[PDB]
Write a protein that binds this ligand. Structure first.
Ligand SMILES: [Ca+2]
Ligand SMILES: [Ca+2]
Ligand SMILES: [Ca+2]
Length: 223
DNA sequence: ACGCTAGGGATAACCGGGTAATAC
DNA sequence: GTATTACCCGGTTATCCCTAGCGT
């Protein structure tokens, strides 16, 4: 076998890299479980072939989170996160951090769940059959936040920013969250698009499930 | 008198395209 | 010359927080 340190700065078509890639067969349980939450959240899973391999591309303002995800997928990630500096239409500078895994058939398992016929969809019983506490944690860290951002608020209600999904898809996600994790949640409307509202009653239930997996610099998102 | 939420707006992300670097 | 592909880019906007001023 080959150590990552030996390949991480070779060319894309380097034979040693391909030999390093061939040693890896599957995502570990943690990378797959977190992957579910990430693809529900801020993650871009893509194929350049016809579904033979997939990679995940990442972009985040939060560098520490980017770092944490890169460490989680360490064996799949050759490069540190690269700084992305861009200029707005208003003239403002915008900083974010970019990273990607290399492409690999091990990522097909994640893609098969969501990417059917070249389009990001949600399967019927996704939450019920796949979403673990770890998945929920990464989903929250990607899409999660407060319902009440007022200073000195007593409201402990959570929001999951699911605006890219259809109303029907989000309803199914709600049905799952309620049945599997006993969360008192329902669909609400922002910009004529769906979000998931988790009531303040269920705050402790939600927080206890995800606490093992969240990082300090993502705690600001919690009420 | 003030908890709460619909609506605002500049991002913080998603999404594909291009290319520099091996192999043959 | 062609295939290969990880690390960038830049086009876009649905996010992701902030708050007006509604409702009681
Ligand atoms: Ca998202
Ligand atoms: Ca996010
Ligand atoms: Ca988006």
């Amino acid at each position: 076998n080959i150590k990552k340190n030996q390949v991480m700065n070779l060319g894309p078509n380097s034979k040693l890299l391909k030999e390093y890639k061939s040693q890896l067969i599957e995502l570990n349980i943690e990378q797959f479980e977190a992957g579910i939450g990430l693809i529900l959240g801020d993650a871009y899973i893509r194929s350049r072939d016809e579904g033979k391999t997939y990679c995940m591309q990442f972009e985040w303002k939060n560098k520490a989170y980017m770092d944490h995800v890169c460490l989680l997928y360490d064996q799949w990630v050759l490069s540190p996160p690269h700084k992305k500096e861009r200029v707005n239409h208003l003239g403002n500078l915008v900083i974010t951090w970019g990273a990607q895994t290399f492409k690999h058939q091990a990522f097909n398992k994640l893609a098969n769940l969501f990417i059917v016929n070249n389009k990001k969809t949600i399967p019927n019983n996704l939450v019920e059959n796949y979403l673990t506490p770890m998945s929920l944690a990464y989903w929250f860290m990607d899409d999660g936040g407060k319902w009440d951002y007022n200073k000195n608020s007593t409201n402990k209600s959570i929001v999951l920013n699911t605006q890219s999904f259809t109303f029907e898809e989000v309803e199914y996600l709600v049905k799952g969250l309620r049945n599997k994790f006993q969360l008192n949640c329902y669909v609400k409307i922002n910009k004529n698009k769906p979000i998931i509202y988790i009531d303040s009653m269920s705050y402790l239930i939600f927080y206890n499930l995800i606490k093992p997996y969240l990082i300090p610099q993502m705690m600001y998102k919690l009420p």
